Amino acid sequence: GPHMATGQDRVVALVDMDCFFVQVEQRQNPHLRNKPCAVVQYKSWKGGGIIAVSYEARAFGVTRSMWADDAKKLCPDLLLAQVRESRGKANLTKYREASVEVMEIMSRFAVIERASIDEAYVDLTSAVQERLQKLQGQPISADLLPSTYIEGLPQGPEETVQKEGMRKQGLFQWLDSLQIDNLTSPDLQLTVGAVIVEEMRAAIERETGFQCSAGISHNKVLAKLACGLNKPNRQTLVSHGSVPQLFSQMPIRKIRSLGGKLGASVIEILGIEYMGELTQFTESQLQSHFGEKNGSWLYAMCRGIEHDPVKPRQLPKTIGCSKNFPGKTALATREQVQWWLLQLAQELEERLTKDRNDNDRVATQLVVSIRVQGDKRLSSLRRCCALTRYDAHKMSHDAFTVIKNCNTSGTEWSPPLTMLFLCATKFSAS
DNA sequence: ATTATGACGCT
DNA sequence: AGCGTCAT
Ligand SMILES: Nc1ncnc2c1ncn2[C@H]1C[C@H](O)[C@@H](COP(=O)(O)NP(=O)(O)OP(=O)(O)O)O1
Ligand SMILES: [Mg+2]
Ligand SMILES: [Mg+2]
Known about the structure:
6-stranded mixed beta sheet; 4 domains; 14 helices; 16 strands; DNA polymerase, domain 1; MutS, DNA mismatch repair protein, domain I; alpha+beta; isopeptide bond; zinc
């Protein structure tokens, strides 16, 4: 009892931007603000593919992966913004630069781990300790947490007919219970972490004009889950004590890393649907079905416990460019293949050169991946070679050299390629 | 014809 | 080294 770890050692948050690519386009074009809007790529086929959707547009049922022509059927007044196109492919530079704006603000507060173009984990354990020392015995006011939800509250016994009324009542219950006394209560630490995350979210909105949501908990999985509970423009605190009720009706697929085959297996092999049901199995039983690492992870995670560290990494480990060639457009000639490789290499060269100037590093390996027609896998084949010069002509020529014997017969290229992907990796200081 | 592209585990 | 999974 006295010796059972409860996964309450850290304070971790996950900050994720709300409808991020849309906000980027709305900041730039004020006519799009506060309107049902989506961002699309490649307008020629079915009006383009939607990759981001404003919350006003979601209310009509518009979603990612939907065709714009189809989205317009659900939402006639839907406004659209097109992703920039360069060299015949989508160019996501505008969103990467916007991402940098936000990541640089978050880094001021604590160590972060970039997790995607629009989210990062934050390890607030040290910052909370410092803040706790800064205010001795200072009780925490509700005004310090104007956009925070406490998951699981309010509980027990009219302002609650509306959502802000629920939020405030739950926050009051939580704050009324908190003992400022006792610098080591995990709940107190989370609360101070939440205050700091309000400050962080305020700074991002002030300095970039972008709104975001956040989750604060004791580990990355719970912080990520918490982030999505009250999006948009709100933050949610998930305490250790909230986990049994929260996990009791939480579908297994909603937990990070369980959204694929492993999660399906868990459900299928154990005959359960919710994360909390995992507690009735022994660690050995879970290890026997899903392996040593997965079994141990599951046994601790269904109890709200996870030890994956927030890595101190702001910069991407790899830099890559890819393009799909669906259906009839699959590449069928040598020349075609070489031209598209050159287009990808030119974009890559730009991004690498910038990376070298900004971050004092150079990539040393080039990985080329291709997908052949009829193959469902992301990558049909991967090959690599040395990246010794940031030269687009050398890179595209070397990439062709490494995959040219994949061609069964021809001038002609077969089987046709439905994807080309160039990735620069193995960075070293410069 | 659900795209562009990341991190990282397994062998 | 090369492939498979899970992810936004
Ligand atoms: N499958 C995909 N393919 C291409 N781009 C994608 C993508 N999923 C996301 N993006 C791009 C476009 C997105 O804007 C961005 C962030 O991904 P989220 O955080 O998953 N989604 P958002 O921020 O939009 O809304 P909110 O978080 O409020 O739910 O990455
Ligand atoms: Mg987001
Ligand atoms: Mg995200």
